[PDB]
Amino acid sequence: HHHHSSGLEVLFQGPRRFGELIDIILSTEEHGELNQQFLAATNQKHSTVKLIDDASVSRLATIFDPLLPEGKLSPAHYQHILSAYHLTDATPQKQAETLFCLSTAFARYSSSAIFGTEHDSPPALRGYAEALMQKAWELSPAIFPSSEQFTEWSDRFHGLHGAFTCTSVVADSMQRHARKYFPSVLSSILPLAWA
Amino acid sequence: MQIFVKTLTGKTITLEVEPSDTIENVKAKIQDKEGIPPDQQRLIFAGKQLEDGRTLSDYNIQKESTLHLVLRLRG
C-alpha cells in the first residue's frame, strides 16, 4: 500500500535520502554537532548559524578534504552517493542530473541564505559543490547548456578568472536550469523548504 | 623550482618559481595561470600571511611546498 500519491512520494523520499547523504558526509561518530547543524539547516530557507569564521573553515576542511582528493569526488565517496540514491545501475544522464541537483543544494548551503553571509562563504562547501558539478559534467555534458556555462559556474565557485563569487546567485542560476530541464530530479533532491 | 598553490576550495595551481621571487611575483604568476587579480589574493604558508615585498626564501618555502590561497568568496 502506497500512503502517498505517486507525484507526492518525492516529498517524503527526497528528505529521507538527503538525510542519509548527510550521515555519509558528516559522520555521527566524529561530527555529531555539525551533522545536526546540517540537518537542521534543511528545515528553512534562512539560517542564523553561519560557518564562515576561521574555526568553522577549519572544521569543514577536516570533513570534506578526505572526500575531495585533488579537488574531485573520491571514487569511494561517489559510489556512496550512488548507493544512497539507488543509482548504481542508472543511466549516466540520470546520475548526472542527480549530481547536478546535489551540487545546487550544496551551493545553497554555502550561500548567504544558509551557512554563508553576504561577503563570505564556507570554501569547503563551495569546493564540494563544484566537484559534484564536475562529476555531473563528466557523466553527461549534455545536461549543461554549454561548456562555457559549466566553466562560468565552476569559476564562480572557485573565484577564478575574475568571476563573481556570490553563491546565492550561483545556486539560483543552477536551480533555475534544473527546474527548466529536470524539475522532477530537482524535487527529489532539494530540501523542501529550499525549493 | 616547483611549488603548489591550493585554494581553500580545493583548486591546485602549479608554479615555477625561484627562492628569490617576491610574494608579489608569485601573485602575478597566479594571475597568469588562473586570472585572479593580485590585490584579491591572500597567500598563506605555515599559518603566516605572506607579505608582498618579501621573498619566498624569507618564509623558508622550499621545493614542492604548498601555499594556501585565500580568496574573499561571497555568499
UniProtKB/Swiss-Prot annotation, chain A:
Belongs to the SopA E3 ligase family. Changing residue 160 to A: Slight decrease in activity. It comes from Salmonella typhimurium (strain LT2 / SGSC1412 / ATCC 700720). Ubiquitinated in the presence of host E1 ubiquitin-activating enzyme, E2 ubiquitin-conjugating enzyme and ubiquitin. Requires SpaK/InvB as a chaperone for its stability and for secretion. Disulfide bonds: none annotated. Transmembrane segments: none annotated. Interacts with SpaK/InvB. It comes from the Bacteria. The N-terminal 45 amino acids are necessary and sufficient for secretion and translocation into host cells. This N-terminal region binds the SpaK/InvB chaperone. Contains a C-terminal HECT-like domain. The gene is sopA. The active site is at residue 166. Effector proteins function to alter host cell physiology and promote bacterial survival in host tissues. This protein is an E3 ubiquitin ligase that interferes with host's ubiquitination pathway. For instance, prevents host innate immune response by ubiquitinating and thus sending to degradation host E3 ubiquitin ligases TRIM56 and TRIM65. Required for inducing polymorphonuclear leukocytes migration across the intestinal epithelium. Preferentially uses host UBE2D1 (UBCH5A), UBE2D2 (UBCH5B) and UBE2L3 (UBCH7) as E2 ubiquitin-conjugating enzymes. It is found in: Secreted; Host cell. This is E3 ubiquitin-protein ligase SopA.
Curated annotation (Swiss-Prot), chain B:
The modification Phosphoserine is found at residue 65. It is found in: Cytoplasm; Nucleus; Mitochondrion outer membrane. It is a peripheral membrane protein. Changing residue 65 to E: Phosphomimetic mutant that binds and activates PRKN. The record marks 54, 72 as: Interacts with activating enzyme. Changing residue 44 to D: Impairs ubiquitination by CRL2(KLHDC3) E3 ligase complex. Impairs ubiquitination by CRL2(KLHDC3) E3 ligase complex. Changing residue 74 to G: No effect on ADP-ribosylation. Signal peptide: none annotated. Changing residue 66 to A: Abolishes CteC-catalyzed ADP-ribosylation. The modification (Microbial infection) ADP-ribosylthreonine is found at residue 66. This is Ubiquitin. The lineage of its organism: Eukaryota, Metazoa, Chordata, Craniata, Vertebrata. The chain holds residues 1 to 75 of 685 of the full protein.
